Design a protein around this ligand. Structure first.
Ligand code: HEM
Ligand code: HEM
Lengths: 721, 724
């Protein structure tokens, strides 16, 4: 009778008589902006509402097709079924051709002080204006189901909804790109994408065709160095840098042009995973970066970034040992410093991933008055591409009427029709007209009408790479020389693991040969790893010289040049029934004092009982949340807890793995027994042992500030875990 | 200077000269002698660029593929650069929508052969003549995840087979379990939405382990049977070569005399049924998301061709109502010990695609694509499916002419009066209506006795109504049947699947409602899962009524993967761990003993290229220990060599290799000083799955015979304690 009712219409309440992830409107409705307010009209509230067809007809039985009898044939006249299945059948739209895998969030931007001296852009004029933003973060190679923590460039697209136009800063998490001229983009992407016969491999550049292309195109080496480094595996989108890469122009009210490069510097520091850890994480949480960003917004650890600019007066364009118009060159911050000019806060998750994140459309050609393009030949080709791709991705030329894509300022023009036209126009569809007195009207430049800066143009129509672009190794060498030794090793690790998966040996030898033109130690280390004998002529290949008297730049090193923030990090607390309850409380309160999140992982979900008899709510099982998902591990005392964990292979392995991943491990009291029973060397600077819980946790927090125990790395390679 | 030359047009060779296992290649490169009538049809659409110029799509030679046309070498890019715009345009529009379900998939060409004429059951031409080789294209897939998601997830596996027969293309569109989750097509979007990533955050990818899925399960007990299958190890197959397939639905077959037989389709693999274990499967998605796709492609390049026997359960029309379940209910299987499976033919997949997008991505299957001799039953799930596959393909493949895409074309004639539509390839020149006289009514209808399709005149009696058939209201007997048929090991893995999945469900009332549903299936099942979830079952929950036997059945052997099916040794993979100083003759005798049983040995060393034996000889290695962990192999063997052992004992991944392969119940072979490495690990007294010997070929022989059991299940209780 009750089983019978589950296949009959459901007319009664199904709701029962720490919290899950929820839509932003449910969880942070108080965080608002002008764009979110515009989106409210498109939001729905089915509470108290009947289930209905798309035409507004109430449905009585959502459990059964209309048939010729209870056991009969389904009838073609069932329009309810056919409308339902039909909508389902056509849910999917094409994924982005690159950066298919991504995640989005709303926030706002504030300029610190008017930049009128350098630009007329309205969203950079008034420190009291809160300019809404939408940001999509992404990887690049993988399709939309691929894993978050792969080794890849990360895309970083910010849509500023300004009162005089929508401006898109479409950048990456490294300051250079792989290629110089847009014409090569499909060649480079085809090389990195899965190979066309077997569509293997997903979310990895470790295959023949990528390294083949690298080996024939030395311009790629600079960005390859970045992605072979630990920059290629950020800990979190909240903890990477961001760059527009291209040189743009900035025009002020006098008509004076400054060359400009955009930056985002994360308030939460710059931190990365390690390769083995990253790869494991694609296994146990392929949504790690999306989830972490979603949950950091719900926690209050709101992503914050400072917008920076490198500012170069027009007359200084030719004073560097590199073309500022070359997208494989960066401008070292030692020569041209980054002025922090404003701040972005991400503070609201979307309600519907598809409506907002999937359908959002960015393009670098989406500039606003006060900003202009440069002759960077990568950027020039990009301007064509973004609008064109969106024609098929979002089904036509009205994608700007999709609510996430709408400006918040007026947008009157003479364009008409196209697929899924939302607007209803009633005035003259041509300019000049008199029948409507020529409204809407062109705006004079002094009124905000966009104009192009009158840069001089002298030359010959030609297909030719500028001779000033032909420098392929000096910046890779500078970036190498700027790394710490641990960072250099991980670079060598990156190249060797990736080339290890290249089948054709001549491709690996050809890449190693390229490396001998950057640094001989780097080439030698990779070669040794690949069983490659380097000739003496190779060991002696000539190395590039300093760039404007520069051979290192500290800002190019994650760990020596940037800060590590303790706040918002995650700590696994391993505990079973019988754990010391006061220990847990004391650890928790301490973690919280520094803004760190303690997660209780136990052999079962629900609650565990402390030896004091109190119940403690568990955050998940040990088996479900392995050590790769947390920054550090702490184990509280309690005889029955420790004994349970020592019988648990996963709990023992949790400690071995975190050790090998160079993470801080805290051990209280009898908990050290567990460490001592394992095949692990004796405690080092990152094994905090103590009897007092509060003391131990304070010391444990202090060790976390260092991010990882780099000195452990040598012995870590001998650990069986 | 060479550096300048790389940014100017490339007019010279780039391949290497000489002096020098094989990369994966388009099937036309590696297996051109594996032919069929379909591949020959596809030969017309292939191209040899060797010695050809680089051209626009209009055929215009390109002189400089390295630079946009600008106003000067350092100038602005000109709008007039049609070469650039054409190339970027096409790239900008490469992607098409993924399939709304089973978006992650792999395809391979092959052929089907019937054993004997099935004429007494069906007129279907491809089941009439053992001499003919019917071309097939198969697409295997997962269900939930998008196109980039990982192979070895816990999911149902899809298995669609397109038969290019001479009187029509027939699609058998199946899954790797014999039942489905839901009874009626109208529920399909609800179920799929429930299992797909949740709509606010699109989390999680390739997992049912989240609240909305198990919310749906707890409210729709019809789902429970197929949930048992996916929570078992059926949900993590070793290989698409080592799983079963089922059409699930009762279909009809119709012989030339108009007789109807109710049937159900089966695929039985020659290479047996073998599954991964969960911890292993999960690690596998991290180190190789392409694992099944790669394995299938490499199996074909190796000549370990996927082989499957088509099977038929056949039920005379008059037996329709004789079972303790409705044979039109797709949450119901027909136990093979009530109605046996009759093997009637054999499929072999023997060629890989040339272009994944052209063939695998663009192929369209639909269970509405039957041929004369086969008809539909009133299964209310199947009936809805007929509508969806054509409809979905209109947007996925860009319109109603997707049948003209080469991979989709039939190999027989196909004249009709359809016309136009987006990307019409064929050019028609005759009357476009029927009846016509201006072309004498050609193409013409075909009489049934000539092979024109006809529906078998099944009686239809009822009232127009939306109602679930009373005969479908049995949600718990077949889950119980399935549970009681598993070994205790398989039962434990089912409990672990429920517990891991429900462990990731945030809302506790959903976890409790599922555990409650399990009390109506088996009290011990519920209790084990409730223990792992911190749920205390009430006395009234443990006294919930359990269902009775099914036509006198409480167990069916075929429903157990390891008790009721075969393990096959041939085609399995073995890690041979070695470093510089390995005993060369041990590797040779191992390699040759493995070759003897058709087992592939892989030398994994601390570095790619070559290791040198103590004898002094160079050995090409298959890849690094680091880049090829133990989850990628069926078993591990460590040859002798004091310098090799000494190296691996300092390698953290080589030691973990043994530990992990031990915990994953795999067979481990150690020769001589190799055991020194084993004893130094935290592992117990060597068991039946550790083979130790000094003589290499002796040890390999005993090693291969231990591989015969697939996994060492008796080791399971101790492996839990082993430090990961
Ligand atoms: C400096 C080099 C480049 C950077 C930093 C960059 C950055 C990005 C980013 C972050 C996205 C993802 C935007 C999103 O979330 O929706 C993206 C998308 C894309 N870019 Fe690039 N890109 C670069 C170069 C190129 C080039 C040379 C082309 C080709 C001309 C190209 C074509 C595309 C296309 C077609 C998309 C997909 C746009 C869409 O579907 O919405 N980009 N780019
Ligand atoms: C017996 C249960 C079912 C089985 C065994 C099954 C099997 C499959 C398989 C294997 C595929 C992937 C085919 C491929 O490789 O391209 C598939 C795709 C699909 N199925 Fe199902 N299916 C079932 C039920 C349903 C239902 C009830 C619906 C909807 C009413 C549905 C709609 C679809 C759709 C729309 C696709 C995508 C087809 C395409 O894009 O070309 N299926 N099904």
């Amino acid at each position: 009778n009750k089983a019978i009712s589950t296949v009959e219409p459901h007319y009664e309440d199904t709701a029962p008589a720490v919290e899950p992830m929820m839509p932003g409107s449910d969880k942070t409705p108080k965080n608002r902006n002008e764009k979110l307010t515009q989106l409210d009209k498109f939001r729905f509230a089915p509470q108290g509402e009947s289930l209905r067809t798309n035409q507004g007809v109430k449905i009585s039985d959502n459990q059964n097709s209309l048939k010729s009898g209870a056991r009969g044939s389904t009838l073609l006249e069932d329009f309810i079924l056919r409308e339902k299945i039909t909508h389902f059948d056509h849910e999917r739209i094409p994924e982005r051709v690159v950066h298919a895998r991504g995640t989005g969030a709303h926030g706002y931007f504030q300029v610190y002080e008017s930049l009128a001296s350098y630009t007329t852009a309205e969203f950079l004029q008034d420190p009291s204006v809160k300019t809404p933003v939408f940001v999509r973060f992404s990887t690049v190679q993988g399709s939309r189901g691929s894993a978050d923590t792969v080794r890849d460039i990360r895309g970083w697209a910010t849509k500023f909804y300004t009162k005089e136009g929508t401006f898109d800063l479409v950048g990456n998490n490294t300051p250079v790109f792989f290629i110089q001229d847009a014409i090569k983009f499909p060649d480079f992407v085809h090389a990195v994408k899965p190979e066309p016969h077997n569509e293997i491999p997903q979310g990895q550049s470790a295959h023949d065709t990528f390294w083949d292309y690298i080996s024939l195109q030395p311009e790629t080496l600079h960005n390859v160095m970045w992605v072979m480094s630990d920059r290629g595996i950020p800990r979190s989108y909240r903890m990477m840098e961001g760059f527009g890469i291209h040189t743009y122009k900035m025009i002020n009210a006098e008509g004076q042009c400054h060359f400009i490069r955009f930056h985002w510097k994360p308030v939460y520091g710059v931190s990365s995973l390690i390769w083995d850890e990253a790869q494991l994480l694609t296994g146990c949480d392929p949504d790690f970066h999306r989830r972490e960003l979603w949950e950091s917004i719900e926690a209050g650890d709101y992503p914050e970034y400072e917008l920076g600019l490198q500012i170069i007066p027009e007359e200084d364009e030719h004073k560097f040992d590199f073309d500022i118009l070359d997208p494989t060159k960066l401008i070292p911050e030692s020569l041209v410093p980054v002025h922090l000019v404003g701040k972005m806060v991400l503070n609201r998750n979307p309600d519907n991933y598809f409506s907002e994140t999937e359908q959002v459309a960015f393009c670098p050609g989406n500039i606003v008055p006060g900003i202009d393009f440069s002759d960077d030949p990568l950027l020039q080709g990009r301007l064509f591409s973004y609008i064109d791709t969106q024609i098929s991705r979002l089904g036509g030329v009205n994608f700007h009427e999709i609510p996430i894509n709408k400006p918040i300022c007026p947008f009157h023009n003479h364009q008409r029709d196209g697929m899924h036209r939302m607007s209803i126009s009633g005035t003259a569809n041509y300019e000049p007209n008199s029948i409507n007195n020529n409204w809407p009207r062109e705006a004079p430049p002094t009124e905000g009408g966009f104009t192009t800066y009158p840069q001089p143009v002298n030359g010959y129509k030609s297909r030719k790479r500028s001779s000033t672009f032909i420098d392929f190794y000096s910046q890779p060498r500078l970036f190498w020389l700027s790394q710490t030794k641990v960072e250099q090793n991980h670079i060598v690790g990156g190249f060797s693991f990736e080339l290890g998966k290249v089948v054709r040996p001549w491709i690996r030898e050809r890449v190693v040969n390229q490396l001998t033109y950057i640094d001989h130690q780097l080439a030698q280390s990779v070669a040794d790893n690949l069983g490659i004998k380097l000739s003496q002529e190779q060991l002696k290949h000539p190395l590039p010289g300093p760039i404007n008297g520069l051979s290192k730049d500290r800002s190019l090193s994650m760990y020596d040049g940037h800060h590590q923030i303790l706040k918002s990090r995650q700590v696994a607390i391993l505990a079973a029934d019988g754990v010391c309850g006061d220990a847990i409380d004391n650890i928790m309160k301490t973690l919280k004092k520094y803004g760190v999140h303690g997660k209780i992982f136990a052999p079962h979900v629900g609650r565990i009982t402390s030896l004091q008899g109190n119940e403690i709510e568990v955050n998940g099982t040990i088996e479900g949340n392995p050590s790769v998902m947390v920054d550090a591990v702490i184990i509280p005392d309690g005889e029955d807890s420790i004994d349970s964990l020592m019988k648990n292979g996963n709990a023992k392995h949790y400690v071995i793995q975190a050790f090998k991943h160079l993470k801080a491990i805290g051990l209280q009291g009898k908990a050290f027994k567990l460490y001592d029973a394992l095949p692990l060397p004796k405690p080092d600077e990152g094994i905090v042992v103590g009897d007092k819980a509060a003391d131990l946790a304070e010391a444990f927090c202090n060790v976390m500030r260092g991010h990882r125990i780099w000195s452990r790395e040598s012995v870590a390679q001998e650990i069986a875990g």
